[PDB]
Structures are given as C-alpha cells and as structure tokens.
Design a protein around this ligand. Structure first.
Ligand SMILES: O[C@@H]1[C@@H](O)[C@H](O[C@@H]2CO[C@@H](O)[C@H](O)[C@H]2O)OC[C@H]1O
Length: 185
C-alpha cells in the first residue's frame, strides 16, 4: 500500500516549511527550530511493513534525523530506525546490533518522562531505537525492512505494543536548520 498519513508536528519555535507533496513526496525547510517531526507514512503501522523511501535532499545544518518514526500503544512506545543524521548521532542504553537493508544498526532503549507523545504533553513512554552505525547514503531508493528491527528488538526484550498508531519516514529536527526532500512508499 502507498501512504495515507501526514505527520507535521512542531514545538518550541523557529520555522518549519513542511510541504505535503504529490504521491509519497514531501519536503521540509527549517531554521532555528525547537523540535519537529515531519513525514509521510501510514495511519496504522505494521510490524511486517517494508518502508520504501528516497531522500533526494538530506541537508541538515545541525541536528536532524532521517528516520522511520512511529508509535504503538499498549504500552506506549515511540520507535525509530535512524538511517541518517546531521551533527548528532542519537543513542541511549545499548542493547545490541541488527543488520538490515545493507546497514548495521545499534539498538538502544530510552525511557522518557514528562514528555510530549501521542497521548499528550506530559507523559512517560519508552523509546526503541535502531541507529545506523554510519550514515546511510541518500538519493537512492532505500528499504527499511522493519520486521528485521522488530524481531531483533524482541530478541533483546524490547516488545512493541499491540495497538498501532502511525508509522512514517520522517525528518526530525532539534534546535537546528536544514532541508530535506523525501519520498515514501
Ligand atoms: O505525534 C506527536 C509526536 O511526534 C510527539 O512526539 C515527540 C516528537 O519528538 C520526539 O523527539 C520526542 O521524543 C516526542 O516527544 O508528541 C506529540 C504528538 O502529537
């Protein structure tokens, strides 16, 4: 299936020109932001979905992530498959590695408190991360075979929730500027 969901969340200030383009295409131009996550994907995430994308422009000026991004409820988990970033590579509590789609990724968990989520402004949730050990090349058609991450997460006691919220290929930014252009299918 092609994309049916548009993510466009900002907080904290600055500028985020998010453009919801044709098909699975979007762009972002941002400067001096607080936090933001923009992306296209699906209203209902699946553990079996293969996300295809092509980041034609990946041009963070500071801290941005090019990442699969999504939530489950039951319990509330935010997850990531970070394929690229800018000046800051995200980490947390090291759990292992997983190989998928031509890349080796480190696995991390982090627990968030008093934090915004799909449940509201002041919530607790766990984050699951797969973060590529080095930056993925962009401009080429890419696959994230998410099931590989789900299985590797489960092998380190990191179980997703059973009610799926959205699942998108995102540009995230924290206190940064930059540009992206990404197509998702
Ligand atoms: O859908 C929105 C979420 O994207 C948002 O979650 C925040 C996104 O930035 C991430 O870096 C943060 O960890 C997370 O708090 O919460 C609000 C919700 O509407």
């Amino acid at each position: 299936a092609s994309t049916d969901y548009w993510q466009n969340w900002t907080f904290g200030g600055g500028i985020v020109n998010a453009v919801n383009g044709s098909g699975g295409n979007y762009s972002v131009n941002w400067s001096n932001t607080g936090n933001f996550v923009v992306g296209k994907g699906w209203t209902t995430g699946s553990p079996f979905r293969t996300i295809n994308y092509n980041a034609g422009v990946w041009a963070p000026n500071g801290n941005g992530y090019l990442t699969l991004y999504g939530w489950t409820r039951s319990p509330l988990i935010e997850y990531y498959v970070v394929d690229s970033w800018g000046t800051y590579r995200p980490t947390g509590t090291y759990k292992g590695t997983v190989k998928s789609d031509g890349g080796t990724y480190d696995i991390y968990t982090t627990t968030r408190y008093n934090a915004p989520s799909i449940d509201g402004d002041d919530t607790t949730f766990t984050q699951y991360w797969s973060v590529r050990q080095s930056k993925r090349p962009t401009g080429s058609n890419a696959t994230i075979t998410f099931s590989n991450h789900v299985n590797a997460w489960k092998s380190h006691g990191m179980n997703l929730g059973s009610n799926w919220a959205y699942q998108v290929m995102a540009t995230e930014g924290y206190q940064s500027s930059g540009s992206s252009n990404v197509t998702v299918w």
